[PDB]
PDB file of C-alpha atoms and ligand atoms in Angstrom:
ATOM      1  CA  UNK G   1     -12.810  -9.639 -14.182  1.00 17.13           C
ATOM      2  CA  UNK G   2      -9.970  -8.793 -11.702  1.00 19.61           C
ATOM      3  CA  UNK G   3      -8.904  -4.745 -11.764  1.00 17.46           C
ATOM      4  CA  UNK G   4      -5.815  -3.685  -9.775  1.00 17.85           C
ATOM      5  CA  UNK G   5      -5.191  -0.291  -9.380  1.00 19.16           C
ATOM      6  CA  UNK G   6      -2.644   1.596  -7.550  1.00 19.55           C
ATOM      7  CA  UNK G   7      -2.219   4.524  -5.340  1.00 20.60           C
ATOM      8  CA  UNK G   8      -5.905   6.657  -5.063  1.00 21.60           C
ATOM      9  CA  UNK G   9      -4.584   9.437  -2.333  1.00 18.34           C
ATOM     10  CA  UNK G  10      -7.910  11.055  -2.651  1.00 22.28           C
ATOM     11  CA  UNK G  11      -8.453  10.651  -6.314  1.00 25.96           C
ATOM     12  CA  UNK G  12     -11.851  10.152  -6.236  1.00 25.77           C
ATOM     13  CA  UNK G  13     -12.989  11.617  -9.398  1.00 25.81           C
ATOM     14  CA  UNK G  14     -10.032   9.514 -11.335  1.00 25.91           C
ATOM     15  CA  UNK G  15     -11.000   6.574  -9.145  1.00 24.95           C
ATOM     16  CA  UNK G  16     -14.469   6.579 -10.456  1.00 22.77           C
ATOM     17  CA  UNK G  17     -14.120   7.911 -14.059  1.00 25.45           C
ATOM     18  CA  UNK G  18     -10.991   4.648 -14.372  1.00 25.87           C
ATOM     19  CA  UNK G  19     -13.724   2.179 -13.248  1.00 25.54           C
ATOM     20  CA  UNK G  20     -16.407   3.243 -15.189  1.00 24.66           C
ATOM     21  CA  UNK G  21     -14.309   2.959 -18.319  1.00 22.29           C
ATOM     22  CA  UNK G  22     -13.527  -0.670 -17.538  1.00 22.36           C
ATOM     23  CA  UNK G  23     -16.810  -1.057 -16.621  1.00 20.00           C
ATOM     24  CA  UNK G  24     -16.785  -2.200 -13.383  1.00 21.78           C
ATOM     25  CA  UNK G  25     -19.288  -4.515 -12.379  1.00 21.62           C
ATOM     26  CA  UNK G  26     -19.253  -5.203  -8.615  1.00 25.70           C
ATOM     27  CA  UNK G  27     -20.721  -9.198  -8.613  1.00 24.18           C
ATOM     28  CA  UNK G  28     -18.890  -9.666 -11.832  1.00 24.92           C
ATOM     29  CA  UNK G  29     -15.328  -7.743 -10.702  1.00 25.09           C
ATOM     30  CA  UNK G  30     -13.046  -7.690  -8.168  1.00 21.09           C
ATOM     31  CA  UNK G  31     -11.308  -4.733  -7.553  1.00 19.82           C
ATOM     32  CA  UNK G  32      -7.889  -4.842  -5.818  1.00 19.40           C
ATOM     33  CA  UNK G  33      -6.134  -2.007  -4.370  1.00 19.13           C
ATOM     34  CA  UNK G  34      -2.465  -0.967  -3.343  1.00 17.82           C
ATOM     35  CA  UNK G  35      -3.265   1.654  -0.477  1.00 18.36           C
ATOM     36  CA  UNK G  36      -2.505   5.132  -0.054  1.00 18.12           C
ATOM     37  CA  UNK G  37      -6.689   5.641   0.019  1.00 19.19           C
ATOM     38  CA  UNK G  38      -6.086   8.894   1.289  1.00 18.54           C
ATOM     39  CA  UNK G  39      -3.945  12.197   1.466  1.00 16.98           C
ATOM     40  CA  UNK G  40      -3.027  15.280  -0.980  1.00 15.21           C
ATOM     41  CA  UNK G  41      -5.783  14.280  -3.304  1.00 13.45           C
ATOM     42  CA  UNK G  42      -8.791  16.416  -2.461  1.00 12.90           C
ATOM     43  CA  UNK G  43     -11.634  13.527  -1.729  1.00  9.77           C
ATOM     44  CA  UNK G  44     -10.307  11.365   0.599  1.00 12.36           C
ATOM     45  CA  UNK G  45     -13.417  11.137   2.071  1.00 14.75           C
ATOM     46  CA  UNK G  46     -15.644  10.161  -0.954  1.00 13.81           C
ATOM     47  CA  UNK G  47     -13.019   7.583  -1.456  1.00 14.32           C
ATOM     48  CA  UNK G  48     -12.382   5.732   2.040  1.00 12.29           C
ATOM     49  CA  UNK G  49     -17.126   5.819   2.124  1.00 15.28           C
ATOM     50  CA  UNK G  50     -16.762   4.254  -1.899  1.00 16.93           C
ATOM     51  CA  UNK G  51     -14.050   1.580  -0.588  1.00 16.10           C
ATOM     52  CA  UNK G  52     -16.129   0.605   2.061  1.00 18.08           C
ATOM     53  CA  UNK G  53     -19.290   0.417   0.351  1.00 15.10           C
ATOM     54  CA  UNK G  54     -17.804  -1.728  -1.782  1.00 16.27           C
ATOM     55  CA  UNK G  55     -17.903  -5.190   0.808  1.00 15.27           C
ATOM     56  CA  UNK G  56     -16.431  -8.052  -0.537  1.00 15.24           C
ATOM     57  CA  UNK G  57     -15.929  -6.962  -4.279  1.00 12.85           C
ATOM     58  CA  UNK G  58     -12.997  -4.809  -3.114  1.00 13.72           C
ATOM     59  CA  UNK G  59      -9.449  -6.759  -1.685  1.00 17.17           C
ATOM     60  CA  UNK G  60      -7.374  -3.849  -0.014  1.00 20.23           C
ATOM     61  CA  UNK G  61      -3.699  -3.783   1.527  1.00 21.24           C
ATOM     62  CA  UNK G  62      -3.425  -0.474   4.134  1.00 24.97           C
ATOM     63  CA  UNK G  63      -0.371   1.837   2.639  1.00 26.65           C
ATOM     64  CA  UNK G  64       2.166   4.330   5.172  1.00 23.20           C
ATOM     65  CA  UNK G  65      -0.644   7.618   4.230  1.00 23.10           C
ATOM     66  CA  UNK G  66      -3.647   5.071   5.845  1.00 19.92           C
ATOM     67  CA  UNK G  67      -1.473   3.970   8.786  1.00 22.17           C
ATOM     68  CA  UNK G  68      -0.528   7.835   8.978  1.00 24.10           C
ATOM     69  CA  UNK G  69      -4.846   8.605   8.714  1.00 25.49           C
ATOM     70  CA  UNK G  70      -4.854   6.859  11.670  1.00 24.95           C
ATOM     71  CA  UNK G  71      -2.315   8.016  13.891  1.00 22.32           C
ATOM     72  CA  UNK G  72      -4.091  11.736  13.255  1.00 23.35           C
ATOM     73  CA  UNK G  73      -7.513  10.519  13.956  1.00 20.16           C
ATOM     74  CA  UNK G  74      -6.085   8.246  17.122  1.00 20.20           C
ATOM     75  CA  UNK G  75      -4.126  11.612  18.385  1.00 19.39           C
ATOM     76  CA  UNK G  76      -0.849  10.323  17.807  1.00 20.58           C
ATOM     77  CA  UNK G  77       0.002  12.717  15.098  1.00 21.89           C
ATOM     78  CA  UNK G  78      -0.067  15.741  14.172  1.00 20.89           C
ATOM     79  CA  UNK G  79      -1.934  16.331  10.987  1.00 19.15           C
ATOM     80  CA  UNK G  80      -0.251  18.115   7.935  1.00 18.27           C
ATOM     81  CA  UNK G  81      -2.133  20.815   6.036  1.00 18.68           C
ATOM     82  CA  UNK G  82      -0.554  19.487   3.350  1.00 21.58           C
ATOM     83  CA  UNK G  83      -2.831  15.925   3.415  1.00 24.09           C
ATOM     84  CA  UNK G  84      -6.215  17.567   2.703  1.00 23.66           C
ATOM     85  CA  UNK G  85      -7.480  14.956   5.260  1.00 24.10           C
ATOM     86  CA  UNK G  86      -9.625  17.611   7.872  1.00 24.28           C
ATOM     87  CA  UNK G  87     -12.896  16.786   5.306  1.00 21.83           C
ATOM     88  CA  UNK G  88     -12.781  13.063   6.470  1.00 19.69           C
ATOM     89  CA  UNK G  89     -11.856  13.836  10.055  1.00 20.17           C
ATOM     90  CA  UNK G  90     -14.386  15.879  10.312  1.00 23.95           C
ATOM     91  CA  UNK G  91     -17.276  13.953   8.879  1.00 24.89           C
ATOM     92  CA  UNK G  92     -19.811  12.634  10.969  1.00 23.19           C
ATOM     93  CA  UNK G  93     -19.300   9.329   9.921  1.00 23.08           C
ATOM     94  CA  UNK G  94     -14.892   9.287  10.920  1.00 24.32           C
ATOM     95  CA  UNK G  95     -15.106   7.110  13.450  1.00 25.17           C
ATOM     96  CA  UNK G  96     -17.127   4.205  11.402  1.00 23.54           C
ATOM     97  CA  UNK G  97     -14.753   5.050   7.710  1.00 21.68           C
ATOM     98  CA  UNK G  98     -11.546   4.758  10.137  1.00 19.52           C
ATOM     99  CA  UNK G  99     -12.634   1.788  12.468  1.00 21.55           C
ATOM    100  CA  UNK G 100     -12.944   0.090   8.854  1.00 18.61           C
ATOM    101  CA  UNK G 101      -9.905   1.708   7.584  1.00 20.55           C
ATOM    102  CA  UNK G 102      -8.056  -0.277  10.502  1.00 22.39           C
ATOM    103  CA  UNK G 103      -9.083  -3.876  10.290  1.00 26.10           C
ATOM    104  CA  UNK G 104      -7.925  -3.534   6.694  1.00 30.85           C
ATOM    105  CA  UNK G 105      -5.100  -6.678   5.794  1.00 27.32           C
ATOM    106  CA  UNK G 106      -1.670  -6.026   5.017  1.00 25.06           C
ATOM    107  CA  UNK G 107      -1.481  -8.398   2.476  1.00 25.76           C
ATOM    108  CA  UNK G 108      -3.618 -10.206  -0.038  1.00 26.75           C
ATOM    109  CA  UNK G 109      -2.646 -13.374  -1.718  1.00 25.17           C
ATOM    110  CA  UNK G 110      -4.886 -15.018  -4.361  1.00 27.20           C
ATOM    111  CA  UNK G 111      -3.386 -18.599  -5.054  1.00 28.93           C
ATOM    112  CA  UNK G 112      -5.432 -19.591  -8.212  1.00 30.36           C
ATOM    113  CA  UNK G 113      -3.719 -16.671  -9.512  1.00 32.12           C
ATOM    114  CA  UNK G 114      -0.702 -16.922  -8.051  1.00 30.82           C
ATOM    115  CA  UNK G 115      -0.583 -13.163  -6.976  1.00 31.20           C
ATOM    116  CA  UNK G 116       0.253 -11.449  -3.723  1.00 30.87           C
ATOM    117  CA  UNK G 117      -0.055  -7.625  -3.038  1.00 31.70           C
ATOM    118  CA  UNK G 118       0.554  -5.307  -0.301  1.00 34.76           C
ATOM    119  CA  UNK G 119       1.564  -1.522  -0.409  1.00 33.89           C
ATOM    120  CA  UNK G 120       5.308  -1.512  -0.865  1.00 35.89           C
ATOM    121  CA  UNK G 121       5.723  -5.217  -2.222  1.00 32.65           C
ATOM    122  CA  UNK G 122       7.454  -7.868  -0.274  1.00 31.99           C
ATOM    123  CA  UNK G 123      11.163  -7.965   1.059  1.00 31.67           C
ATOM    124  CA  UNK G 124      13.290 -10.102  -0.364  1.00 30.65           C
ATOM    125  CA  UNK G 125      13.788 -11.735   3.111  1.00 29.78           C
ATOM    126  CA  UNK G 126      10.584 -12.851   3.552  1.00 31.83           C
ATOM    127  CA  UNK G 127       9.210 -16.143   2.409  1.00 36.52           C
ATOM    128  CA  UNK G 128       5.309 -16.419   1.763  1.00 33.23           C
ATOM    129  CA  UNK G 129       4.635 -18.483   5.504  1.00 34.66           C
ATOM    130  CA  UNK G 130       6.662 -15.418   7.005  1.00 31.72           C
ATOM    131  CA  UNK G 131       4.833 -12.395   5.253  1.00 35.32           C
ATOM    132  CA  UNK G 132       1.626 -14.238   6.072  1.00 34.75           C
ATOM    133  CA  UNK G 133       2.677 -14.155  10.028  1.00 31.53           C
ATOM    134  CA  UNK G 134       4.147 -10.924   9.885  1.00 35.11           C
ATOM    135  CA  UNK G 135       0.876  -9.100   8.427  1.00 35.20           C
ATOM    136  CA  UNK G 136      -1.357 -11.497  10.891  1.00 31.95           C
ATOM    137  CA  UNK G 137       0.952  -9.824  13.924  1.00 32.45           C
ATOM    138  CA  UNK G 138       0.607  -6.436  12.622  1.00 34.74           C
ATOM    139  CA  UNK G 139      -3.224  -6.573  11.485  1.00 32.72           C
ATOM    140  CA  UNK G 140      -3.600  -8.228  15.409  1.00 28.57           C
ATOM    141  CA  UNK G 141      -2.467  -5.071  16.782  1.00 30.20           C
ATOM    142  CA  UNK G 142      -4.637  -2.800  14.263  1.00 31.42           C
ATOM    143  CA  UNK G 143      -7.769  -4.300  14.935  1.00 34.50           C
ATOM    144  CA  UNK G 144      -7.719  -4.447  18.582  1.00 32.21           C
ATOM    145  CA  UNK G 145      -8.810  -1.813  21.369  1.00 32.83           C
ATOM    146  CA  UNK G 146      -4.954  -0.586  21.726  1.00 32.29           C
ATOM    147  CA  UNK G 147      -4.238   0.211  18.109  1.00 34.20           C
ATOM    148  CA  UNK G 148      -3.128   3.977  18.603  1.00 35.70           C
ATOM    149  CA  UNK G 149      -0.226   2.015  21.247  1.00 34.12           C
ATOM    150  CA  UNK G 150       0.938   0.390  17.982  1.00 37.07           C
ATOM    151  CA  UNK G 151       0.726   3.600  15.826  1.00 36.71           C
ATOM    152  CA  UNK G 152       2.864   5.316  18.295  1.00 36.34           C
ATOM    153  CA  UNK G 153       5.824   2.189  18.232  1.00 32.44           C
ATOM    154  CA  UNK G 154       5.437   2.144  14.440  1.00 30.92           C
ATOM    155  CA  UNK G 155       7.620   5.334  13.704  1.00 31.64           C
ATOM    156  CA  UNK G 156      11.418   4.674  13.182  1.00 34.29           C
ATOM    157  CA  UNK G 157      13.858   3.227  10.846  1.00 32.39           C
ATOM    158  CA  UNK G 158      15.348   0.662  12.459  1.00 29.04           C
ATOM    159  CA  UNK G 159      15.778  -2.118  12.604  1.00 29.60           C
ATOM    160  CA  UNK G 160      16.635  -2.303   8.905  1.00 30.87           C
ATOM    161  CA  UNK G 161      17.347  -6.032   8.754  1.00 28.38           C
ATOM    162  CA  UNK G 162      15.096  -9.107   9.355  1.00 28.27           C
ATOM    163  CA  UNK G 163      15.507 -11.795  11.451  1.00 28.08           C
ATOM    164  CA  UNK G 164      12.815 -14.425  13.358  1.00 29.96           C
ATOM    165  CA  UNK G 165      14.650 -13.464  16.424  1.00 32.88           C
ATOM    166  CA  UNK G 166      13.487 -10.064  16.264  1.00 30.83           C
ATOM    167  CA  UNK G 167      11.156  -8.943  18.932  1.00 34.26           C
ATOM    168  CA  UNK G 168       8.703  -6.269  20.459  1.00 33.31           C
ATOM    169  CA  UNK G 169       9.185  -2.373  19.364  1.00 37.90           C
ATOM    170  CA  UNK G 170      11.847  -3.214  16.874  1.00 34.64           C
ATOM    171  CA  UNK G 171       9.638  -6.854  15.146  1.00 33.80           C
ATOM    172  CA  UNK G 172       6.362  -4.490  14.520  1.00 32.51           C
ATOM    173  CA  UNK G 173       8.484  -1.798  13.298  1.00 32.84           C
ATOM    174  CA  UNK G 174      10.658  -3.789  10.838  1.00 29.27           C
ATOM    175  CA  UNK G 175       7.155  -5.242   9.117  1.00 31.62           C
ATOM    176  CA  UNK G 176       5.197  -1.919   8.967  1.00 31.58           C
ATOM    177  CA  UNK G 177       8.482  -0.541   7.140  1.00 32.12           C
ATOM    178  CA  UNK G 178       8.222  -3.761   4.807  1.00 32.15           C
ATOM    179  CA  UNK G 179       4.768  -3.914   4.264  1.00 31.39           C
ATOM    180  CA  UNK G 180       4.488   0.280   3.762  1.00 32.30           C
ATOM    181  CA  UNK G 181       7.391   2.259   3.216  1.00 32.44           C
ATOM    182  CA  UNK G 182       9.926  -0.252   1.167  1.00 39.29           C
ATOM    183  CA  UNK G 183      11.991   0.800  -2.588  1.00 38.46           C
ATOM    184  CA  UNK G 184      15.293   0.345  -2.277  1.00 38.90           C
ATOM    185  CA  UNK G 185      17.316  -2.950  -0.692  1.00 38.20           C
ATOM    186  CA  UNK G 186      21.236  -3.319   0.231  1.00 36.13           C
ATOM    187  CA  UNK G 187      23.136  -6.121  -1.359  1.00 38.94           C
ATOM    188  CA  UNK G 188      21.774  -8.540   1.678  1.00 39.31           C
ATOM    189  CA  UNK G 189      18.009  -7.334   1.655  1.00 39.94           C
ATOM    190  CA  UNK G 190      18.427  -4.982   4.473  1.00 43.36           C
ATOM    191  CA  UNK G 191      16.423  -2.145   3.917  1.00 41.64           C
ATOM    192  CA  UNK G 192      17.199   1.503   3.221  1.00 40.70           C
ATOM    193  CA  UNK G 193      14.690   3.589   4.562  1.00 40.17           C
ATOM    194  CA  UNK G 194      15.733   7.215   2.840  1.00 40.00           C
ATOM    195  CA  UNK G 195      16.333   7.575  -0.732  1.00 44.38           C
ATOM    196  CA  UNK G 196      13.077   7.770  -2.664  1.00 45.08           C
ATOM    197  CA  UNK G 197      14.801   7.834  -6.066  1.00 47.04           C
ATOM    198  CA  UNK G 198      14.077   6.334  -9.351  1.00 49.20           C
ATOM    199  CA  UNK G 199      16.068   2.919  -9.645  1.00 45.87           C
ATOM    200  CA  UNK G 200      18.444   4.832 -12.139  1.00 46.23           C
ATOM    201  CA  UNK G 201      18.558   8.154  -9.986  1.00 50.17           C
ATOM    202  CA  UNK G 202      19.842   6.126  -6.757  1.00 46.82           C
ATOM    203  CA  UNK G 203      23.461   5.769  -4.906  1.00 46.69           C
ATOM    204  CA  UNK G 204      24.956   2.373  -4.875  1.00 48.94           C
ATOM    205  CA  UNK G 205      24.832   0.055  -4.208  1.00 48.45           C
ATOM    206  CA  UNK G 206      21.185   0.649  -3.736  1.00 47.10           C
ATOM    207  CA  UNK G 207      18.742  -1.882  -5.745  1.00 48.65           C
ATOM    208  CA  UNK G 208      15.028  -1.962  -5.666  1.00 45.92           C
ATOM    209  CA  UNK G 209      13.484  -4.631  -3.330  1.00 46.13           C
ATOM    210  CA  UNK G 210      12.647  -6.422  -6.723  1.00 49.69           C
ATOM    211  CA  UNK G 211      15.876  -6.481  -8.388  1.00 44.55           C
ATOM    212  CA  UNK G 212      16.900  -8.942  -5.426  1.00 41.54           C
ATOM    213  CA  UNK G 213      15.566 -12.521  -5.968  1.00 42.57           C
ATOM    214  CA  UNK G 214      13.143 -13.282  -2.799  1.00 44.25           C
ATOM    215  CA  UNK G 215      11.534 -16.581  -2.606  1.00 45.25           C
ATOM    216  CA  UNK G 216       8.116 -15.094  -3.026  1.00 40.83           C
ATOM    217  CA  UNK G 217       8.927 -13.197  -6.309  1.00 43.60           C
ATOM    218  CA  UNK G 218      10.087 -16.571  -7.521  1.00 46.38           C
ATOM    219  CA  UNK G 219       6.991 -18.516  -7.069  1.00 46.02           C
ATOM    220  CA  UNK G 220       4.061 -15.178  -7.204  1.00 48.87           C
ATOM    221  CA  UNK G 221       3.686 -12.199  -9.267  1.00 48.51           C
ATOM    222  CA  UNK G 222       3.520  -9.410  -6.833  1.00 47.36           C
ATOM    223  CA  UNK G 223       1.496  -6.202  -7.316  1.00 49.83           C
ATOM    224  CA  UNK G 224       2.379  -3.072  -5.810  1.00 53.07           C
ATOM    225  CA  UNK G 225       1.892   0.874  -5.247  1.00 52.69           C
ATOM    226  CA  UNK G 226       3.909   3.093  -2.902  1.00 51.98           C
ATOM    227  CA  UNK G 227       6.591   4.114  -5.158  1.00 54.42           C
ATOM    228  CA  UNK G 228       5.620   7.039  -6.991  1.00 57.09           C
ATOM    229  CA  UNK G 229       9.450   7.786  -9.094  1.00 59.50           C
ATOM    230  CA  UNK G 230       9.635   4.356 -10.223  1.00 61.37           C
ATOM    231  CA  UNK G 231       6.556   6.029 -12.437  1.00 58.71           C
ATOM    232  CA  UNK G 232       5.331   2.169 -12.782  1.00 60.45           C
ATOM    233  CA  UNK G 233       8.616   1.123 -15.145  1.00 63.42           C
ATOM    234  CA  UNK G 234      11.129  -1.014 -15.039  1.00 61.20           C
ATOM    235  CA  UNK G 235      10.300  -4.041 -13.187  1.00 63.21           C
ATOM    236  CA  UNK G 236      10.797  -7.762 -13.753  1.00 64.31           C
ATOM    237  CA  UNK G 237       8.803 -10.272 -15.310  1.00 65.65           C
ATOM    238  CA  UNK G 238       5.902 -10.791 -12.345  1.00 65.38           C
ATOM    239  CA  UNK G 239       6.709  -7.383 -10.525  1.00 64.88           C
ATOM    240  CA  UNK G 240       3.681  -4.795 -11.104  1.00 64.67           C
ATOM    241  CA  UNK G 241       4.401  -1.262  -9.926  1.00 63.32           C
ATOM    242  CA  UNK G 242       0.784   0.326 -10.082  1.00 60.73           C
ATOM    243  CA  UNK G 243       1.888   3.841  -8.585  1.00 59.64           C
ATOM    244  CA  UNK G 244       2.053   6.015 -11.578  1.00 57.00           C
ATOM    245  CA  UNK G 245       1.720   9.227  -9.089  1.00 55.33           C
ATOM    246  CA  UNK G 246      -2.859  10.474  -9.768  1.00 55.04           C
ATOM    247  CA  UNK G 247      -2.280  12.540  -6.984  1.00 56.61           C
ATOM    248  CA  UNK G 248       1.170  14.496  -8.186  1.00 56.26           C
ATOM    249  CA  UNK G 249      -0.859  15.125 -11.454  1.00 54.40           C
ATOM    250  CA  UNK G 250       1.053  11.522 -13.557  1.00 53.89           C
ATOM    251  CA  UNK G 251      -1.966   8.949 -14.159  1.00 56.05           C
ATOM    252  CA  UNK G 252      -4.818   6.801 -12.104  1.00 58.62           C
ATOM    253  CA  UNK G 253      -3.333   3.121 -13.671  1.00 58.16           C
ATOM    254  CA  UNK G 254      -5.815  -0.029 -13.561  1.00 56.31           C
ATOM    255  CA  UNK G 255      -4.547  -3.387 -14.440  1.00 55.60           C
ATOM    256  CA  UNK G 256      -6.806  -6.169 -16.037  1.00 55.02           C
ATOM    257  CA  UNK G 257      -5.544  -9.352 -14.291  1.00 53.98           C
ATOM    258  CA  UNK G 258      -7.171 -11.791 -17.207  1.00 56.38           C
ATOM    259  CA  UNK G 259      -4.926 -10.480 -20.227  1.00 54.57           C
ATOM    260  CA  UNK G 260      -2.626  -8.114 -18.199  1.00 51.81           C
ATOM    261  CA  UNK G 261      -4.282  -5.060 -19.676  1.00 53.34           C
ATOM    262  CA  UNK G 262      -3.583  -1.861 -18.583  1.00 52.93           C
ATOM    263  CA  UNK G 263      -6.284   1.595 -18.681  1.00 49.36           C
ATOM    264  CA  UNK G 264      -5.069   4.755 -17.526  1.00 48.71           C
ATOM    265  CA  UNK G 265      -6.598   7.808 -16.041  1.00 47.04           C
ATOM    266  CA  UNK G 266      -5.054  10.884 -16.647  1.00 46.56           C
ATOM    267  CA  UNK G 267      -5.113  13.167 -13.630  1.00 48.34           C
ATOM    268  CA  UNK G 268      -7.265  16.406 -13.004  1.00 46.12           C
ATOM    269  CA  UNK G 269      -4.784  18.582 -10.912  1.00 45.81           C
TER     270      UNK G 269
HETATM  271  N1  LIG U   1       7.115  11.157 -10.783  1.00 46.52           N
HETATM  272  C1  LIG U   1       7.986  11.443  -9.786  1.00 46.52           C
HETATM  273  N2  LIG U   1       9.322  11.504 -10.033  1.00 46.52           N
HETATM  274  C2  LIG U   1      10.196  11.790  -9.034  1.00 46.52           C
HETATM  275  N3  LIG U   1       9.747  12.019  -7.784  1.00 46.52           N
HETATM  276  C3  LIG U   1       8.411  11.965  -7.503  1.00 46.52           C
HETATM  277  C4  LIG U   1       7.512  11.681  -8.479  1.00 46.52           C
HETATM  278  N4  LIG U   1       6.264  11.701  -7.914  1.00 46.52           N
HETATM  279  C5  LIG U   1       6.389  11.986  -6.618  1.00 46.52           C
HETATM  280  N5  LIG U   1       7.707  12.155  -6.344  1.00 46.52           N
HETATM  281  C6  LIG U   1       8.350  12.481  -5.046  1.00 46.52           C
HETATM  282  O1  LIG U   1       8.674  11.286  -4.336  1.00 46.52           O
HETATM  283  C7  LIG U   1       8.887  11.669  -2.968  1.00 46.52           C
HETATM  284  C8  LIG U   1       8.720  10.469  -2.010  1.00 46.52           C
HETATM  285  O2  LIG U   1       7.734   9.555  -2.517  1.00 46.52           O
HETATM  286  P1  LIG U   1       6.229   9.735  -2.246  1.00 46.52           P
HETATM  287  O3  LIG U   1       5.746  10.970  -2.980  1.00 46.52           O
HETATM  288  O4  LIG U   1       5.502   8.530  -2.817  1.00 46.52           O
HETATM  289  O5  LIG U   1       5.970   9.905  -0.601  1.00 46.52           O
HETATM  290  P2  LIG U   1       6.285   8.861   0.664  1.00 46.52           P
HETATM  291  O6  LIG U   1       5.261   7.754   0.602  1.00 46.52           O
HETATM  292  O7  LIG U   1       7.669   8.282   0.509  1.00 46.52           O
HETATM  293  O8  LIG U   1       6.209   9.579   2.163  1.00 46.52           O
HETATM  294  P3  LIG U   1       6.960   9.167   3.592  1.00 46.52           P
HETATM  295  O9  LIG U   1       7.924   8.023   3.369  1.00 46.52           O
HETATM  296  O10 LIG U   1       5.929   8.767   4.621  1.00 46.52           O
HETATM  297  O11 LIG U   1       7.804  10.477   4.152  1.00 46.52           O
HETATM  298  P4  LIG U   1       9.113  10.577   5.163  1.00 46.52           P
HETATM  299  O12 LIG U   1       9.890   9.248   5.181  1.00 46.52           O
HETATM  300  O13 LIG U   1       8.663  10.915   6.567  1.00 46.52           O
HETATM  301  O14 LIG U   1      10.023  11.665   4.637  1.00 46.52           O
HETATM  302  C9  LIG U   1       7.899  12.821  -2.689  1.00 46.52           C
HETATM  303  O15 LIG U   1       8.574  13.857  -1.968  1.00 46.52           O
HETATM  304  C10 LIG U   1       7.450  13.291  -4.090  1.00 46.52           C
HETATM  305  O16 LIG U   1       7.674  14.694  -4.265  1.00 46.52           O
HETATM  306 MN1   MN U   2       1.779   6.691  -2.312  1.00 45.12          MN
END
């Protein structure tokens, strides 16, 4: 069986008590995950060592709070009290979890199933060949000696709008924001990097990335976390918003790829 569940941000104990109920069967099951491992949840570090144990039977995208795990542990960043991350920082086994953490893809596409996922879902101006190069460019610069360079260029909002001319600072930045911090679209795709509304709560002429018909959306169903006010409603047909907010006390939600069945964990907080 395939299991995709969304946001964790150090929900270990929902993590675990969600996958026993669908009994989880690493060998058997696959278990995909949105991102956002880590951060306000209180085990961040039992959950980045489970991940990881879990080889081949787990298929993750890296979310912003990973890429932001990252830049702290690199020295790029400051770190927030307010992420609960010092536990994992200051394990003895950091450097191996993060080094891990890092080579992590982007993006995950499954063909025989016609799905693709990454944290934030995939802008409308993107085809599948470009979201494939973009996430090869970015996970390039992730996995190599010079990673905490990237981190550094990743911060900022602009450019807003893509184009294959783009290049450098503002090319890496324009696919992290795409791949990890993407809701709402203008009219012509460009992105707006500020409101974090519910799709009902927002300012025109604001529309979520999915309410804009993208040539990937039209071929894949696309699975997604990230955006915690959409509370996992309101999508198209194909569009699966797993973030229904563990960590902010909502629900852990798991989706059963076979018959599109959902199981919920209610939050401990
Ligand atoms: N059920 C909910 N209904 C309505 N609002 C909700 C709900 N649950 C959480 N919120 C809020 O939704 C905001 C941004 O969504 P989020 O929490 O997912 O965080 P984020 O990933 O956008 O963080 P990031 O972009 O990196 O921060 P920044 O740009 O530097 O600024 C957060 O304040 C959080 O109170
Ligand atoms: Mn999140």
């Amino acid at each position: 069986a395939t299991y995709l569940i969304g946001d964790v941000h150090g929900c270990y104990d929902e993590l675990i008590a969600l996958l026993h109920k669908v009994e989880f069967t690493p060998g058997k099951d696959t278990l995909w995950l949105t991102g956002a491992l880590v951060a306000r949840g209180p085990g961040s570090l039992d959950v980045l060592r489970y991940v990881k144990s879990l080889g081949d039977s787990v298929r993750l995208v890296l979310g912003n709070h990973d890429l932001h795990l990252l830049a702290v542990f690199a020295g790029i960043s400051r770190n927030k009290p307010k992420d609960r991350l010092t536990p994992l920082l200051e394990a003895p086994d950091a450097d191996e979890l993060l080094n891990w953490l890092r080579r992590q893809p982007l993006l995950q596409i499954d063909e025989e199933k016609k799905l693709v996922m990454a944290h934030a879902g995939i802008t409308p101006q993107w085809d599948l060949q470009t979201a494939k190069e973009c996430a090869r460019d970015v996970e390039a610069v992730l996995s190599s000696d010079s990673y905490p360079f990237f981190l550094d260029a990743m911060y900022g909002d602009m450019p807003n709008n893509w184009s294959p001319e783009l290049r450098g600072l503002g090319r890496l930045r324009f696919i992290t924001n795409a791949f990890t911090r993407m809701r709402f679209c203008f009219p012509n795709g460009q992105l707006d990097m500020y409101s974090k509304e519910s799709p009902e709560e927002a300012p025109a002429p604001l529309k979520p990335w999915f309410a804009i018909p993208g040539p990937v959306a039209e071929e894949y169903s696309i699975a997604f976390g990230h955006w915690a006010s959409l509370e996992g409603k309101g999508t198209p047909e194909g569009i699966y918003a797993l973030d229904t907010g563990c960590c902010w006390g909502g629900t852990l939600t798991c989706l059963r790829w076979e018959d599109k069945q959902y199981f919920v964990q209610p939050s401990n907080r």
